[PDB]
């Protein structure tokens, strides 16, 4: 879990390797809040954050 | 508005002088927030050694700033020579349980299979249930809304009363939801349609549940239709009747209690229309007198002859259908038609929602969005000579 | 071929189209097929006025709808046009649109005190701009040198010689390309520069007292297991190098890593391509009061007129004064009633 200094303050994100299956080796990128409740794409995070933040430049999978 | 509302606050204090000799009880309380939903439940509790009742109610705020709750208060009704009888509330009306709900209550109605268990209505197109038993009385300052079940997909709320589980409701799809909650798993809060009903063109309104027919429901909407609807018709799409119902849109429907073939529609066309299931292309009665739109129309569980309907126009009439025609006076013509039994002034702004109390005979609830919430029984003598 | 304005139903402004074929059935009516020009907002600024875009929408029409005829040019024909030419009649198109798929060929400038720099003034021809180029710059290689490219070609052979016997005293062609890499080539100009292009005083350099130097980049320096961490760490959080040292080689500057990642990419190995409140109850002298002097409160009337007034002294007076002293009809009647007298 990694800091995401892009994202306000106590926001991480993780990246996972898929370990088998159709896609084994591909990567899933996931973000965690400050209280820990876990994200799993732009626009989930968007409807999150609301306008307390613009992501339309964000990157999810890079965090940047 | 600086003029208007003189003459309404005028109005009021008129009303208010005149109370003791329209009605036997006036009870009013100012919420903190308006509410747009209120329901007797059915239960009564009567302490020992009184000289009073304990009813309760479903009442919800609808602030867009604070933190929304779905209300029960509970009000205290009597049991039945210096003139008058005034007193001020202090203690009466109180409430007893505030849930904290995701934005604002547009409507919320009880189970009556399980009266614990409140479905509620929100703005958007899903329908939350709370069980008052499990929350606590008094929410914390969070706001962190815990319902029980989320059911996924107009104020369109009606529980069947005789098929346990199953809800209905309008959506901002122009069709009409059907959930089912008599088995859910145990795995899964959020729950999906059963059927969606198609039929309408414009905004589904107002749907309600036939009373003793399990299957068979109608609906209401701005395309100015009642359609009568069957869940055991293949076809989800066309409805098993529909009828040009109104001249405008039409938003509230009711069923008699007394009567399986008789209902009412009100709508947008200043007119409560009363209709028939065995012949619904004749429309058996239009009443007239409201001065704006009519939003909500309720029967009566005492008496089948009377109804009350609502709007935008501040006041309630109450009509009693059991002496249309009657031979009155040309004098008493300009006041209105015999039907119209009574009219009710407390109000200053739109009437949202009123009920009709189940126990205690004709005892109303009504509210509206000056935040005034008034408990009241029209005077003796008026409902009979 | 030729461009039509057809009739808008709706009052609007004209529907533009090309005829591509006209018509004329054995009744001697005329009918006209043509290929649509969208309006921009039809389309479902940069767009001009006259706008209009070539559809693959195919539609026919009777010549009754035809009301005029116009051009619709070429974008460059369009800004040819003379002031005096400009009508009504002339459109353009620049864009064909897929009417199905919705498919279409293939920020201010600011002034003031906060945004322009404060422009520096040339040096008077005796003012100096005083910049310490030591405090700048330190130079590296100098480009004038006694040397040939014969000479440094040949003491860049030597510095990759040492290097692979310098790593031969603690595979054979793996040490001397692990000499050769670029690191040791760099290491052998600065080597020489240093020495101010002295290549007898340069080799001395590399090896200072009979024995020689090492330099390995990164990609060679790394142990097998750190290597092996590597390749885990990439697999797991793919190239987010910050977390890749945190949490898998914490003992190894970020930097460093950035430059082993690069190096390791080109890996033999590696093959990743493919108000007012109240209450009210009434009391019973006051019910009885209403019923008494039901002459004068008028029940039936006063329960339509709550905002009239009742004269509350009157009935008060009347019922102290003269104080020694139903059924509904069921709804089956009505509805009967109602059918009976109909609307």
Redesign the interface.
């Known amino acids: 879990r ?1 800091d995401c200094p892009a994202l306000p303050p106590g926001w991480k ?1 993780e ?3 898929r370990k088998s299956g159709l896609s084994a ?1 591909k ?1 899933d990128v996931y973000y965690f809040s400050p209280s820990g409740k876990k994200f799993r794409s732009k626009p989930q995070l968007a409807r999150y954050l609301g306008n307390t933040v613009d992501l339309s430049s964000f990157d999810f999978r ?2 940047k | 508005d600086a003029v208007e509302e003189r003459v309404i606050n005028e ?2 204090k ?17 919420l903190e927030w308006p509410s747009l939903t209120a329901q007797w439940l059915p239960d009564v509790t009567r302490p020992e050694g009184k000289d009073f009742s304990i009813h309760r109610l479903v009442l919800g705020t609808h602030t867009s700033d604070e933190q929304n709750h779905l209300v029960i208060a509970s009000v205290q009704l ?1 049991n039945d ?10 203690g ?1 009306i109180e409430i007893e349980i505030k849930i904290n709900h995701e934005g604002e209550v547009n409507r919320a109605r009880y189970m009556p299979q399980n009266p614990c268990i409140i479905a509620t209505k929100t703005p958007s197109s899903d329908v939350l249930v709370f069980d008052y038993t499990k929350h606590p009385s008094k929410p914390d300052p969070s706001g962190e809304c815990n319902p029980d079940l989320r059911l996924r997909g107009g104020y369109g709320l009606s529980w069947n009363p005789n098929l346990s589980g199953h809800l209905l409701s309008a959506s901002d799809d122009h069709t009409i939801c059907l959930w089912d909650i008599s088995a859910v798993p145990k795995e899964g809060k959020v729950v999906d349609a059963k059927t969606i009903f198609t039929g309408h063109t414009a905004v589904v309104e107002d749907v309600s549940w036939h009373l003793l027919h399990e299957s068979l429901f109608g609906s209401v909407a701005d395309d100015q239709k009642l359609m009568i609807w069957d869940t055991r018709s293949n076809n989800t799409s066309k409805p098993s009747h529909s009828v040009d119902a109104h001249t405008a849109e039409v938003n509230c429907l009711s069923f ?1 209690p ?2 399986e073939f ?1 209902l009412a529609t009100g709508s947008a066309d200043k007119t409560v229309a ?1 209709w ?1 299931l065995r012949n619904l292309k ?5 009443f007239e007198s409201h001065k704006d739109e009519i939003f909500q129309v309720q029967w009566s569980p005492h ?3 009377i109804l009350a309907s609502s709007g935008t126009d501040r ?1 309630l009439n109450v009509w009693d ?2 002496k ?2 009657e031979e ?1 006076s040309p004098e ?1 013509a300009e ?2 038609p015999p039907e ?7 109000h ?1 702004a739109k009437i949202s929602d009123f009920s009709w109390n189940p126990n205690e005979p004709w005892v109303i609830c009504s509210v509206s969005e ?1 935040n ?1 919430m008034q408990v009241w029984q ?5 409902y ?2 | 071929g030729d461009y039509v304005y057809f009739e808008n139903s709706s009052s609007n402004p004209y529907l533009i189209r090309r005829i591509e074929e006209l018509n004329k059935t054995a009744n001697g009516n005329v009918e006209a097929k043509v290929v649509c020009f969208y309006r921009r907002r039809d389309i479902s600024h940069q767009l001009r006025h006259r706008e209009l875009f070539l559809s693959r929408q195919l539609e026919s029409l009777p010549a009754t709808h035809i009301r005029g005829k116009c051009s619709v040019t070429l974008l460059n024909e369009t800004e040819s046009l003379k002031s005096y030419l400009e009508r009504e009649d002339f459109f353009f198109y620049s864009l064909v649109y897929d009417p199905q798929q919705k498919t279409l060929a293939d920020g201010e400038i600011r002034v003031g005190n906060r945004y322009q720099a404060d422009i520096t003034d040339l040096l008077k021809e005796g003012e100096e701009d005083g910049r310490d180029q030591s405090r700048l710059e330190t130079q590296v290689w100098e480009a004038h040198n006694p040397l040939t490219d014969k000479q440094i070609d040949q003491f860049l052979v030597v510095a990759r010689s040492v290097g692979t016997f310098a790593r031969a005293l603690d595979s054979l062609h793996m040490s001397a390309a692990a000499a050769s890499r670029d690191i040791t080539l760099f290491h052998a100009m600065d080597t020489l520069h240093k020495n101010i292009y002295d290549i007898s005083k340069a080799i001395s350099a590399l090896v200072p007292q009979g024995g020689p130097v090492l330099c390995r980049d990164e990609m060679e320096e790394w142990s097998a297991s750190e290597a092996n961490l590597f390749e885990e760490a990439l ?6 190098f ?2 890749i040292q ?1 949490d898998f080689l914490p003992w190894k500057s970020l930097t460093s890593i950035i430059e082993y990642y690069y190096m390791w990419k080109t890996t033999d190995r590696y093959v990743q391509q493919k ?9 019973k ?3 009885i ?3 008494l002097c ?1 002459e004068i ?1 008028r ?12 004269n ?1 002294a009157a ?2 007076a009347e019922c102290t004064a003269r104080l020694p002293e ?1 059924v ?4 089956e009647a ?2 009967r ?3 009976t ?3």
């Open positions: 990694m994100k990246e996972v390797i080796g990567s890079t965090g | 109005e009021y008129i009303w208010k002088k005149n109370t003791p000799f329209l009605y036997d009880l006036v009870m009013t309380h100012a009597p020579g210096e003139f008058g009888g005034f007193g001020s509330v202090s009466k008699n007394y009567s008789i009363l028939d004749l429309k058996l009665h239009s008496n089948e002859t006041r259908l059991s249309i025609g009155q008493d006041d209105g119209l039994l009574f009219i009710h002034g407390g200053t000056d005034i029209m005077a003796e003598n008026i009979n000579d | 697999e797991k959080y793919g190239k987010d910050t977390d945190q108000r007012q409140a109240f209450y009210l109850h009434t009391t002298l006051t019910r009061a209403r019923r039901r409160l029940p039936w009337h006063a329960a339509r007129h709550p905002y009239l007034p009742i509350s009935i008060k139903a509904r009809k069921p709804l009505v509805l009633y109602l059918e007298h109909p609307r």
